[PDB]
Ligand binder design. Sequence first.
Ligand SMILES: Nc1ncnc2c1ncn2[C@@H]1O[C@H](CSCC[C@H](N)C(=O)O)[C@@H](O)[C@H]1O
Ligand SMILES: Nc1ncnc2c1ncn2[C@@H]1O[C@H](CSCC[C@H](N)C(=O)O)[C@@H](O)[C@H]1O
Lengths: 384, 384, 14, 14
Amino acid sequence: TKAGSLTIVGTGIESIGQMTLQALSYIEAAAKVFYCVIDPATEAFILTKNKNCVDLYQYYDNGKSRLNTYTQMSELMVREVRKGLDVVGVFYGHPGVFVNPSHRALAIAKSEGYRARMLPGVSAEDCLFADLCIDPSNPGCLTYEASDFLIRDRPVSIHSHLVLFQVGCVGIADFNFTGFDNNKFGVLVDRLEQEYGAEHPVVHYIAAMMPHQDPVTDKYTVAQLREPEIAKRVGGVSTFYIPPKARKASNLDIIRRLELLPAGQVPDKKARIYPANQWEPDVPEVEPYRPSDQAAIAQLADHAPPEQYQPLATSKAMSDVMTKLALDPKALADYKADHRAFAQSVPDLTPQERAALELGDSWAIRCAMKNMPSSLLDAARESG
Amino acid sequence: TKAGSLTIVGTGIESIGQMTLQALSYIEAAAKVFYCVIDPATEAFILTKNKNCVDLYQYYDNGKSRLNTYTQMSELMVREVRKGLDVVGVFYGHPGVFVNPSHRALAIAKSEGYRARMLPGVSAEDCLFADLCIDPSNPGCLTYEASDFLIRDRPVSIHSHLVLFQVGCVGIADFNFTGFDNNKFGVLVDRLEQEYGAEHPVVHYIAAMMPHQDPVTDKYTVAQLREPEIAKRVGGVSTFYIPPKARKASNLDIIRRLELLPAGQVPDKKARIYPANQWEPDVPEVEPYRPSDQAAIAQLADHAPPEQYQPLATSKAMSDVMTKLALDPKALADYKADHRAFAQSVPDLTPQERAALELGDSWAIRCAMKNMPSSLLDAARESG
Amino acid sequence: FPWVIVFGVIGVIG
Amino acid sequence: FPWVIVFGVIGVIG
Ligand SMILES: Nc1ncnc2c1ncn2[C@@H]1O[C@H](CSCC[C@H](N)C(=O)O)[C@@H](O)[C@H]1O
Ligand SMILES: Nc1ncnc2c1ncn2[C@@H]1O[C@H](CSCC[C@H](N)C(=O)O)[C@@H](O)[C@H]1O
C-alpha cells in the first residue's frame, strides 16, 4: 500500500555476465539506481540500463571511517524510498555477502513499513567453488572474514573447507584510494601456521573480473605467505581457500541409527567419490571408471524414461506468461495485485493454464505445465 | 586446440530470473544442452533457447542408486564432448553446490584434454542469506550436508551461522518419484538438541521457486521438530538455518597485535552494528541512528567527490565491445584467439581503447574507461 | 515435493 | 588493486 520500495541486487563478480536476469530487470524498472561495483564495464552497462544512477563509491574517502561511508550509502537509498520512489541498490557479487549498507538500508526501509527485498547474486565464494572445482558439501565449508577470524578466534575444522574473505585488509578500519600495505597480514599467517602447519597449502584466489581473464589459483605453503614478494600479491579482491588436512571417520552410532549396515560395507574414511579435491595435500588418485561406473554406462543403451517421469507439456502462451512474470517486475506486481484479473487478460491460455494462474498455487502451475502419469498419482503423496 | 568443450552452468533457484546473463548466452551458443532443473517454467525457458536439449531428470528411477544416475548424467555430457561438440550442462542453483555429476563430468573432460569450465550460479544458500537477511561474514558460516553432518560428526560453532542442506533425505541412498518419508529425520533433531538445546530456534527455509511465491521462513524450536505435523513439512527443497546461541569475545593478543587500542574503546562483545540478526534468540534492539550515524548523514549536504575518485569516462564503442565480450561466447573465443586482430576489427574505438584491447591488460582497460586523476597517480601503488 | 537431489555423501550413496 | 570493501567487523570499523 505505502509508496516507495527498496530492492537490493547484485552484479556477480565477472563483468556483466554474472548479473542475474532479475537483477537486470529491476535495474531497468527502477526510478533511481545506486551502485557500488568494481569494474568499469559493469558500471558503463548499468548506466545504459537506467537514466538515474548514482555511484556510491564516491562516499569513500582517505582516512574516512568505512562505517560513516556505509551509513551515508544506506541513507542515500532510504531517502529516495521515503519520497515514494522504487529504488534499486546494486552491489557487486551477492549484495548481502560481506556488505554492511545493503542490510542497513533494507532493515531501515522494512522498519518504516516500506517494501524491502534483497535479490541474491553470485558471490566470490560461488566463483571460488566453480574455479577451484570444489563442492562445499564435500566435506563441509567454514567461511569467515579474515579480521573477525583472528579477533574472535573463530574455530577451524582441519576436516572441512576453510574460506577467508578480506585477507588484504587485516585490522584496517578506514579506506585509501590507492589501497593498503596490509602490514598486519603476518598475524593471519601465524594463526594459519598454528592451525595447519608451515607446509599446509593455502590457495590465493582471485576470480577473473573481465570475461577474457583467467582466475588466480596460486597454491602457496603457509610458510611462503611470509615471503615479502608473495605477501605483496594479496589485495582488496584476494580470497584464501585452505583445503582440509585429513578425512574424518564415520560415527558407528549414526551408521547404526541410519541403518547403513552392515558396517563393513561402509567405505574406508579414505574412500572418495570421483573426483578428489585436487588442492588437498597428498590426495590419492581416484578411479573415475570403476566396474560399477562401467555397468551404469552399459545400461544407457536400453534406457527409456521411467513410467513416473513427467514430460514437459506446456504451450507458448503459458511459457510466455511465466517468463514475463520472471523478467517484468511491473507484470509481476500486477499479477500479485489481482491473480484473477491478470490471468483473465493473458491471451491464448488454455482453460487449465488460466485456472492455474488464477489460483497461483505452485502445484496447479506444475501439472498445467507437466504431464503427470497415472503411475505417479496412484503413489503421489500430494493428498489430492 | 582439441575439438569439444564442456561448460556447466546454473539456473539459480527462483524460476528463470536467477539465471545469469552468461549462463543464458552459453545455453543459446551450445551444440547440445543437458539440464536438471526443478520447475517447469525454467525447463520451458531453456527449450526456447536451444533446439538440442536433453532432460537429465529421466535418468533417476525408483530404487535406482543415485550414484548410478550421476555416472549416467556425467557420461551423456562427456560422450558429446568427445564427439567434438560444445556441450552445456545446466543444473539448478549453483551447478557445483551439492551436485555430484557436474564435478565428475568436468574432471573427466579436463583429464582427457578438453576445455572444461564451471560458471557459478545463485545457490539455495545465496537465497537463504537474501531472504533471512543475514550476512555469512557476521558471525561466520558453517555449511554442511545433513547426512554428512551426522555420519562424520561435523563440528558446530554456537557463535556462527549453521546451514544444513538435504535435511529432507537423512540417510537415503536412492530415489523415489513421489519423494521420501524421511524416517531418520529424528537422528538429526537429536544432534541439534545436543548441540543447541530443545528451546533453540531452527529456521525451516524454502526459497520461492516461482516469481510470485513468498519464501518459507518458519522458525521452530529444536523440540517442535519432534511434532509429526512439523517433521512432515520438511521435503526435497528444505534447508535449515540455525542462528548463533552466543556472541564470542575478542582475543586480547590479537587486539594488541592489530593495534585496536586502547583496549577499553573495543566495543563490548554484545555490541552490534545495525542491524542485529532477527533470528538469534533474545537479540537486543540495536539503534540505527546513533549520534555518529546522524553526524555522518549531516555531512551529505556538503559532500563532493574526493579528488582521487575516478569518474567513468568511456564511449558507446568501448562499452558495446566489453558487453559483447561478456554476452557473446563466440566473440570472447575470437578475442581470446587473437587480441590484436579482434581489437583492430572493432568499429569506432579510440586509439587508447584499441590499444587497451590489443593488450588485454585489466589495468589498461580500466584507465581507458575511467579518468584517473593526477592526485591518484602521485600516490598510486601501481609501479608505472 | 519437488525431489531433485543431485548429491549424496560417501557412506550413503553406492 | 581494485579496493571495494563494503564490510568491516565490530572491533575494527567505527
Ligand atoms: N574477484 C574476486 N576474487 C576473489 N575474491 C574476491 C573478489 N572480489 C571480491 N572478493 C572477496 O570479497 C571481499 C570483499 S567483500 C564483498 C564481497 C561480495 N559482496 C561478494 O559477494 O563476494 C574481498 O576482500 C575478497 O575476499
Ligand atoms: N527452493 C529451495 N529452498 C531452499 N533450499 C533449497 C531449495 N532448493 C534446493 N535447496 C537445497 O538444496 C538441496 C539439494 S542439492 C542442490 C543444491 C543446488 N545446486 C544449489 O545451488 O542450491 C536441498 O535438499 C535443499 O537443502
